[PDB]
Amino acid sequence: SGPVPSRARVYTDVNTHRPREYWDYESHVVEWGNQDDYQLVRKLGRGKYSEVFEAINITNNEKVVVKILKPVKKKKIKREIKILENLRGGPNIITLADIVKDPVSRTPALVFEHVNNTDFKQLYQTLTDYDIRFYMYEILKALDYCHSMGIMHRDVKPHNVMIDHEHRKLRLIDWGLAEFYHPGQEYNVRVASRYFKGPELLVDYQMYDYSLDMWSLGCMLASMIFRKEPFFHGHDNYDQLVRIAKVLGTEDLYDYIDKYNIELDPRFNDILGRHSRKRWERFVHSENQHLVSPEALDFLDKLLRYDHQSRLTAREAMEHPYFYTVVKDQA
Ligand SMILES: O=C(O)c1ccc2c(c1)nc(Nc1cccc(Cl)c1)c1ccncc12
Numbered sequence: 001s002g003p004v005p006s007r008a009r010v011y012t013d014v015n016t017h018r019p020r021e022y023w024d025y026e027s028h029v030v031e032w033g034n035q036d037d038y039q040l041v042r043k044l045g046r047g048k049y050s051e052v053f054e055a056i057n058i059t060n061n062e063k064v065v066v067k068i069l070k071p072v073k074k075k076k077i078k079r080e081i082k083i084l085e086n087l088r089g090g091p092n093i094i095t096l097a098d099i100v101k102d103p104v105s106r107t108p109a110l111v112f113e114h115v116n117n118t119d120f121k122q123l124y125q126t127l128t129d130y131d132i133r134f135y136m137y138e139i140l141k142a143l144d145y146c147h148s149m150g151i152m153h154r155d156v157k158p159h160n161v162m163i164d165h166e167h168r169k170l171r172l173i174d175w176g177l178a179e180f181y182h183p184g185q186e187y188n189v190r191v192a193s194r195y196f197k198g199p200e201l202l203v204d205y206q207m208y209d210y211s212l213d214m215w216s217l218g219c220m221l222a223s224m225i226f227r228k229e230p231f232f233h234g235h236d237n238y239d240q241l242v243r244i245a246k247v248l249g250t251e252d253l254y255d256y257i258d259k260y261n262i263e264l265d266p267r268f269n270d271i272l273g274r275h276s277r278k279r280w281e282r283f284v285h286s287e288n289q290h291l292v293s294p295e296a297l298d299f300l301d302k303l304l305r306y307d308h309q310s311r312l313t314a315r316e317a318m319e320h321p322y323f324y325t326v327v328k329d330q331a
Helices: 074-087 120-126 129-148 211-226 237-248 250-259 294-303 314-318 321-329
Strands: 038-046 050-057 062-069 096-101 108-113 161-164 169-172
Touching: 038 062, 062 096, 074 096, 074 108, 120 161, 129 161, 129 169, 129 211, 129 314, 129 321, 211 294, 211 314, 237 250, 294 314, 294 321
Parallel strands: none
Antiparallel strands: 038 050, 050 062, 062 108, 096 108, 161 169
């Protein structure tokens, strides 16, 4: 009978109501600067499809970041650029400063705003209960903004959240997997990073939406409040669902599969087994208790749901009691 269709509960038709130039990124004309305006200082890291460098803009001595793209479809480069241009100036969204090309190799590169980041592997262990609430609220500002702008990030994870802790400044980076939400579209499920993949990706339910990012956020929150990084530690995409099922239980998983008429891959039948929904208190211990509260657990419970439609939206999440003290302090 095929899967049951799904629509986002919020910002459903935002792209339909915009001119085609907004979302038809393949038609976007890119104007490439000369990479000679930037002098590379050092390599910061290598990605799946990019090499990132710290650089200096020789014209004004500003420190920037240059993301040299490895060859990918021109379609995909135009998508990242168009999304970054559409989101530019939005709350906690990384700023695309320039688009250049090396004169010799012709390799395209994206120039970004520099953030003085403290890596999550060093930062998260130092965060107070207030800090987690504060930064979660900052991520929510970025997500509600991009979702309102008709964009799903599709790769929310600690590496993609650059935090200048000294200045309490946060930027959501790496828009390379981001996509425009169009109601009825069947998207690629080979997105996000394993540990942050929502159950919709794991069961191959393609008609997903912005709510995908809310699952990923919930994975981040659970790792922060429980000091268990990553929270769901699967060995592969199949075992990832098993790890989730051992916490959220199998009853709701099978109800989700039923509701959407999802044809489940036959290997899941043997590996999923039967598991009760675990109480969040089972993850609380002497070393993380100070980060856990009834508000944190209620909020986490409302993000970590199989049914993507039942998760809090970024706007609903911002209104949660977990953030009452942050919201008070920001006024
Ligand atoms: O991709 C983007 O959108 C993107 C955008 C901005 C930054 C970035 C990636 N990666 C950075 N650093 C980084 C750190 C570790 C490994 C790698 Cl590969 C990169 C970085 C640092 C400071 N300011 C901005 C950025």
